[PDB]
Amino acid sequence: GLMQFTLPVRLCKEIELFHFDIGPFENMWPGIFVYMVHRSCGTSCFELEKLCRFIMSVKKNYRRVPYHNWKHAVTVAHCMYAILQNNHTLFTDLERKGLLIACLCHDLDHRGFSNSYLQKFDHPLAALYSTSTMEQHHFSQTVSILQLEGHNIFSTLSSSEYEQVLEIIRKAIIATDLALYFGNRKQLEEMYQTGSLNLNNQSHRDRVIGLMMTACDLCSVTKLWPVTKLTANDIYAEFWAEGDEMKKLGIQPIPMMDRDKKDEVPQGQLGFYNAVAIPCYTTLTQILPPTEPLLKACRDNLSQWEKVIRGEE
Ligand SMILES: Cc1nc(N2CCCC2)c2ccc(OCC3CC3)cc2n1
Ligand SMILES: [Mg+2]
Ligand SMILES: [Zn+2]
Numbered sequence: 606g607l608m609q610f611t612l613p614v615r616l617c618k619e620i621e622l623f624h625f626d627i628g629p630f631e632n633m634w635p636g637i638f639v640y641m642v643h644r645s646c647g648t649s650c651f652e653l654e655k656l657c658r659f660i661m662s663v664k665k666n667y668r669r670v671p672y673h674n675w676k677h678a679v680t681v682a683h684c685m686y687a688i689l690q691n692n693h694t695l696f697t698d699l700e701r702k703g704l705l706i707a708c709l710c711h712d713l714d715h716r717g718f719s720n721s722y723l724q725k726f727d728h729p730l731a732a733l734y735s736t737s738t739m740e741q742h743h744f745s746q747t748v749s750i751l752q753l754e755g756h757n758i759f760s761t762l763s764s765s766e767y768e769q770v771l772e773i774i775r776k777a778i779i780a781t782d783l784a785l786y787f788g789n790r791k792q793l794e795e796m797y798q799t800g801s802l803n804l805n806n807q808s809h810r811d812r813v814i815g816l817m818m819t820a821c822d823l824c825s826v827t828k829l830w831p832v833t834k835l836t837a838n839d840i841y842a843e844f845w846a847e848g849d850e851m852k853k854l855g856i857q858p859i860p861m862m863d864r865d866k867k868d869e870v871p872q873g874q875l876g877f878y879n880a881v882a883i884p885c886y887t888t889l890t891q892i893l894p895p896t897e898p899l900l901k902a903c904r905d906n907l908s909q910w911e912k913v914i915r916g917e918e
Contacts, residue, residue, distance in 0.1 A: 707777035713746035780815035
């Protein structure tokens, strides 16, 4: 009960900042996550024996893909940690517990292919889950791991508290389906602007947690430019593999997934920042003012991509 995780001084300080990068030492990432749970939630939130066994089974069920890997899991959980730490009093005990776990689990057993590619391939998961295919799978893998012997990190919750947290995790993980983000943010925009947004309305909280999940999932675009630029390589490595697999099914992929159209990446990033990222962190900053550093970092990166296009890099 008296066993705190501590970090070296540089990490202890920078882990509190939105733009923190967890580093290239995989063996420190479990301790980084436990450190964040303990400070976000408490040293009592979970039995350490069970949490450690949970973390290591989750790690094992992430695959060795360029981007949708164990590093992404921990990175997305860190962005959620920064949001929660900058909005201390807005979230319940159950929500702080649920959301760090949802983030760690949100891409379990990802193969590096989109929902689209699964549907065109006619993958069995596309027959089992007609929409949000991978996300329903990620939630399924999360429940599977929670049910392994010694892995039920929620055992100490009441029956109804257990149902509530599993329901937060399910909605949180389904919300990472970017196809759902557009309508979710549009509705949050209207509610915020007509003044009807009400954090005591469960349907509204659900929508705000949804947008936090998009914000954390896209957080590559809110890092310092060298981290953003090097992560873009990993992202495009999966996109180009998917485009290659489209060409194998005899389907010309969209240009974003065609490795013969790498020249178009900088302009593809502009569209993405303007159509997705900036609108996302803008609405997030309206609802949760202390998350403004994410919007500022995102605009800084938009400006860096504008500079790549102007051939200034
Ligand atoms: C061009 C670009 N870049 C992406 N990543 C860069 C950093 C975060 C995600 C994307 C991540 C998901 C994605 O799904 C497709 C969205 C456009 C309708 C598209 C993306 N398109
Ligand atoms: Mg995902
Ligand atoms: Zn993700």
